[PDB]
Amino acid sequence: WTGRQKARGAATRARQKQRASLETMDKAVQRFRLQNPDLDSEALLTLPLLQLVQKLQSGELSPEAVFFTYLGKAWEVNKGTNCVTSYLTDCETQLSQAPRQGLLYGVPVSLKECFSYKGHDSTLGLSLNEGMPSESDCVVVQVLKLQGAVPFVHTNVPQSMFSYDCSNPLFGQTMNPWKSSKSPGGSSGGEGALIGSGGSPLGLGTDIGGSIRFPSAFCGICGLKPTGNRLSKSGLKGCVYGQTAVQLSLGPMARDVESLALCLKALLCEHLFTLDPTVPPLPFREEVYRSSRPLRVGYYETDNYTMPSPAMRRALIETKQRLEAAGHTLIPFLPNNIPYALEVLSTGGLFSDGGRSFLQNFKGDFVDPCLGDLILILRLPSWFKRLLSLLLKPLFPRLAAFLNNMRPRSAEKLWKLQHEIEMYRQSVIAQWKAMNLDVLLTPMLGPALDLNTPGRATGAVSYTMLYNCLDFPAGVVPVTTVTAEDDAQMELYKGYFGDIWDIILKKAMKNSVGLPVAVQCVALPWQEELCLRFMREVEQLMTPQKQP
Amino acid sequence: GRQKARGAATRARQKQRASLETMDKAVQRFRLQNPDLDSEALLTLPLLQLVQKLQSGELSPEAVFFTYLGKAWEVNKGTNCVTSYLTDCETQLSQAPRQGLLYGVPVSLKECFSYKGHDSTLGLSLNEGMPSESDCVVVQVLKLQGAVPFVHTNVPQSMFSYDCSNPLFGQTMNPWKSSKSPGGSSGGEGALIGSGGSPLGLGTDIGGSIRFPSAFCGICGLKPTGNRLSKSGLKGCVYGQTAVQLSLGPMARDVESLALCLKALLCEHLFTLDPTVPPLPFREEVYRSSRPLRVGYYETDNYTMPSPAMRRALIETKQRLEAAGHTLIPFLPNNIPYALEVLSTGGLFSDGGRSFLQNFKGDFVDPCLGDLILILRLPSWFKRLLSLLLKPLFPRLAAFLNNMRPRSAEKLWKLQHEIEMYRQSVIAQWKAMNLDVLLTPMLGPALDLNTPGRATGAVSYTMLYNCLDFPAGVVPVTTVTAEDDAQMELYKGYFGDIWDIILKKAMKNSVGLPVAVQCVALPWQEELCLRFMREVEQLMTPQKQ
């Protein structure tokens, strides 16, 4: 499996398809601008989604104007970020058929590459998925269209999507819009970079360990990861099938909280519930989202696993203080047994089979540098992972724990693991109830890491993956930017373990002055609305300008 | 080495016995003080009217409680369905919230519903003398709704059986005929409710365990979508198996009781006490709807040959539905053999039965489990070899055996994905015919005692819907006639294997026994399923409403 001829051909075809996509976009944009030289494109692009939707609904703005202006912006920002892999060809005719009463009528939407779109590949950056066009739209894409939205691009992902960087051997490397030496986060990185630079008002991503929340935080936009089965995953392209211990979740990314709420409201409709009867038909509860009642907010400033950067810590602390001044009750709270939840439950659930299924995607392919040593490590014989685990344990317990829990096991041992996950979930729910919390405020990893380092700082997924394990809805809101004072204090950063993950993270988070920093908002399962209500509160207190 | 298990049986039997004497003493005191109460009339009131009389003050909770307690005690004498009297229920009786939707309603509980201070043995020695620390969530919710859970009812050992006997409390009998099984695993519930000793009960179902007892005993039952109700605090024997989900649900004498129970359970108390349950309140208007339905139906699953009674029940129900304005459409979910032999069996026994078997170490194996334990205990290589040998002549037996082997997490992932895609397949098949609901035969009449464990094939009609995770319920529609029974002599299964042979003899001698049909809707469509069951009930037994 050393021959790369097939992988080379795939990359050649994918690069040509991307190139032609971009040229097509460029021509449509130019043809539109010629016919409409007087359109104030800037005013349109800076309209918050809610106002854009309202102008589309009234006819003040035509769907064509919104579409081509956003298309032009996407084409331009793509020049510096390489976030767009494919222009969704037929979308110009979808545009002229958008249901006029849709809650998203005329809204251009960007899709992580894994959302199946009829006639396009969802490569996931893998050569084995190239030249295999989807034969239908996935359910959420169908629902977006029935709501009058216009999906227009596929955006880049790191190879296989199992990464919080954003590069692959087919379409190459996506860069942070704020600083080209920084990762935009991942795996919904193309989305983060496109939306964070103003090239799309709304995107969909997916999240199994933070893949909606990393790019949102790194690129300074809002993102929500719902409860796993709140939205349909039917028709999504994946790399691993039937793993249910740690469920994948899909959700919106956008420039403000109102936009995520609008998106969930449009998605959680009869169309969705009929197209996919396996989704519990819970309508979006607007009144919970709009509530202005005082909250009991649990919080922590560190999970004692990944030492927060000075920027993360300042962000958390200032938010906590504004929430208290606003009349909320802030209560110290830390989910129990985080090291166990991350090392045993999460890692174990994601790699119950030693990585064998996951590795099947890589046979004969290039392994992108952004994946670090993951593929090499997964490839290690089970016995040798175990032996290495016992050796590293006295020195680097964190590294030993991960290694040990990435081993293959029987169905019997997986049942045991699944029961522990269920019990862990109940244990954190009980802590929460005993403290009578409404929501939970936590740090969110930031600022953006240097390109090619996320794959070498696996420990830093601790803040986000805990909530995939727990399957609680969790969103991120940008609340500040790194100051020079913050950046200089990185030199004093040691990490709790001082292993290679802490060493890499320390270096990767330096030189980040000016970069956005977020906090994370969490609520109980199926409480997406309450989670958004809290996010809305945070956004309003930290960045009052984002709301009318 | 079963001495400890004999001690467990001795202790359990003493507790059951003391529980029964306590019940009798309280019933005798109450009667002496209330010699003029019309017990007959109270006991026959449909639940809806009983609830209204408790709510209006026309009937006292004490009167209802002690009247049912006496009835439960009496019917237990011929069925052995009660394992425990829930010690503090009399004080719950006096603190029962007046505003509750179930105010003063005595409720029976399958033994796996944890009740503070009580064992949930599952008929297993290893669970004896391990009292629950607290009530399970559904019990908490019942009490918050003013209901009074008053007994634990019997289950077959481990609950993985559709008969109802275990080494601790012994064998439960069908109230209609003492030589017949009450079904299972919610068999105690079936026996108790079917003989009038309780107006409402809760069971669980992973392969038909709410529906068998309901059909065999001539009552109504609903198996909701797996995660519609909270399983928090439920006692189980296998943990972490998520391919085929356990579901919990109500059993009662009529459909309206089932809808009332779901309505009372699907409240803020439940959703707050167990946030992992999607907070979907009961949708009254779907339940109450009177719009004509597109009803898919089959007379047979081409897997278990229906008994003449089952077939007649299905056809008569179909005709009555057609005459009532509904559209009947022939429809059979695709690849049922696959769903049963590969998906369901493989899902239930992905580990070759090792987790299951753990419960039986040092314990007796009830005869009602047949050869299940012995078979599961065989080495994988031997199940495989035996499977290849059976395949030419007995493909059904071969398929089950081969799919009960242990496998890696990798293969379990593959299996889980196949279950998911099969669900999508049947849903697409269902939507291509634009169905609202699906009408199917339900296994019946009740099998002779100790035969269910030897007629595993017969779970075909029920287990398909655990695999697919669709709400499914059963409604009694007729009784076995002299002709139905005589026609059993002509009965031939499609396979001619031992399961077909056992079933044929097991369903004979059933004159007068109840027979049901099964109603099915799509995931999360419990209300539509109940709407349909209500219709079947109204059309086939008009006096229930």
Ligand SMILES: *[C@](O)(CCCCCCc1ccccc1)c1nnc(-c2ccccn2)o1
């Ligand atoms: C993202 O959530 C992935 C974010 C990075 C997660 C890294 C997790 C980890 C844990 C232990 C060792 C190494 C790495 C995401 N988005 N999509 C997906 C995904 C994953 C699997 C299948 C489909 N999609 O992950």
Ligand SMILES: *[C@](O)(CCCCCCc1ccccc1)c1nnc(-c2ccccn2)o1
């Ligand atoms: C009932 O639904 C069980 C009914 C009988 C199912 C027999 C299935 C079968 C399949 C293949 C070979 C042999 C037998 C029920 N109720 N509760 C449970 C249960 C099961 C496991 C754990 C907890 N509860 O099953």
Ligand SMILES: [Cl-]
């Ligand atoms: Cl669910």
